[PDB]
Amino acid sequence: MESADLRALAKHLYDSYIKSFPLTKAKARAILTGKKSPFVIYDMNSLMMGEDKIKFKHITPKEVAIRIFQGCQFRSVEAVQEITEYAKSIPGFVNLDLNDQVTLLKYGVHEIIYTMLASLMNKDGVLISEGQGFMTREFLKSLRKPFGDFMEPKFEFAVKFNALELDDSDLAIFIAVIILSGDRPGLLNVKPIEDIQDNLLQALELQLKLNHPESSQLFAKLLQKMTDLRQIVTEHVQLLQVIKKTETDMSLHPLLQEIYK
Amino acid sequence: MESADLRALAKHLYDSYIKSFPLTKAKARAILTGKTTDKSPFVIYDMNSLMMGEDKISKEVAIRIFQGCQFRSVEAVQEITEYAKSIPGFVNLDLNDQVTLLKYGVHEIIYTMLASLMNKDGVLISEGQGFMTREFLKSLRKPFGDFMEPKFEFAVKFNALELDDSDLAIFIAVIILSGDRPGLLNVKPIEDIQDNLLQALELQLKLNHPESSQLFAKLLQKMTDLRQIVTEHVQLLQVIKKTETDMSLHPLLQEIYKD
Ligand SMILES: O=C(O)c1ccc(-c2nn(C(=O)c3c(Cl)cccc3C(F)(F)F)c3cc(Cl)ccc23)c(OCc2ccccc2)c1
Ligand SMILES: O=C(O)c1ccc(-c2nn(C(=O)c3c(Cl)cccc3C(F)(F)F)c3cc(Cl)ccc23)c(OCc2ccccc2)c1
Known about the structure:
The structure is a homodimer.
Chain A: H1 3-20, H2 25-33, E1 39-41, H3 44-53, H4 64-89, H5 98-119, E2 121-122, E3 125-128, E4 133-136, H6 137-141, H7 145-162, H8 168-179, H9 190-211, H10 218-246, H11 254-259
Parallel strand pairs in A: 1-4
Antiparallel strand pairs in A: 2-3, 3-4
Helix pairs in contact in A: 1-4, 1-8, 1-9, 4-5, 5-7, 5-8, 5-10, 7-10, 8-9
The structure holds ligand A1IP7 (2 copies).
């Protein structure tokens, strides 16, 4: 690929990433650093007021720890549709076999949700409802039973990931790289997937050298984070199963259970 | 680092890798592909060929084989430790960090270098004098059968990269100098060394595999496969520990897996 084509691919992905995702990293950092302050949820009473004054669609209709956990699950489903739409803009993606498109999205969304959640996090908490709200790390970590220990690993990853100081133009290509992973189980035609990922990796490499020229070997270090992502996604799955087999108070309307399966 | 300094570091690391590891990938491939009469391995594919293999190269066969693997893993830890001492900057690090880097790194390197000894049909043993088939290992009883197969699965994919020893020497160094190991005290001096090693690996792969597009990225993505298999392995050991109460591990290995 020629250098100018890689920059074209990078710019294409950045524009689509801006249209697909409501709250960008650039805007999220402005809210987090305090540079219209978000409503802060730091305890039980502040949560109760936030749902009454603001309409947090994922924290309304039970026990608080379960409602918060389910709220994270409800937002994760919304993000899946945003990731799906963004994937359609990746050159070559919609031309892949239809089952392979579904397979790539099925096994990639968790890694991408974790990646993009870091954009909304700092060491003290996480933005919610398109940056209108802020839930503290301490409030999430203090939820009872396994729900508290379910939340903290996300902040631990995000803090490490955010030290790379990626911006949105870096992240748009990186997320594209994750989607086009040829090692997903059940892929039928790996070759066009790895061919697209090779273009995306070239575009990411050049993007990082031009956008972070003093950040030595940032490309390599970002690729090493794909290990952290896979590891934490597998831990995540094992934490859910434990919650599922233990907790008798998790029942939603069956139609809801289907949607948010 | 300048280009000539990166080439110097690659040659340094390849030199130490030859001095540290008795069975290289180059020699392993010459034995496996055959076409020679002086380095043909004896092939162990069932009980009878195993029994004859012991004369040519106590307890239940699956246990004896597992013990064979653990004994060679200990030797591998010894060879890996010796190579690590040669990586510029490693011995100058805080001593607790040296232990920590080796604790979490040796297994990822064992799996990497075990692939050199593998093809889809089996694995070289006893310094390449023997060859134990994949089917025979898979057919062991209890948990031991499924204990063997995940290694072959990784190797088939890893070997498709067609790395040679000079490539692997730098890659193995990159793995050891990982700043994200749990419990490290001084992450910065470790990451500075890894940066030079990553630069050296990058230049090495471009010169040695110029048609292999993005091989650098693809090789780094393999560190994900490595991390996963080490995790599966540790969980398989635990099942064996609670099932086989009369089976001991080497002290060096038991220290490595604790936490
Ligand atoms: O806006 C967005 O892009 C957004 C994106 C993600 C969350 C998110 N999800 N997540 C999870 O566990 C989770 C993750 Cl990482 C991956 C897959 C599935 C899950 C699932 F399914 F298990 F949920 C959180 C855990 C923590 Cl600690 C904090 C946030 C999340 C998100 O949370 C907003 C939120 C926070 C609190 C209460 C209600 C909503 C927002
Ligand atoms: O030459 C070398 O560098 C070499 C290096 C490794 C083995 C190795 N070990 N290993 C294990 O399980 C194992 C591993 Cl990976 C790490 C730590 C502890 C263990 C323990 F404790 F579980 F054993 C194998 C499983 C399979 Cl399937 C194939 C190979 C290994 C190796 O095996 C050669 C061999 C095979 C059969 C009989 C005798 C020797 C060689």
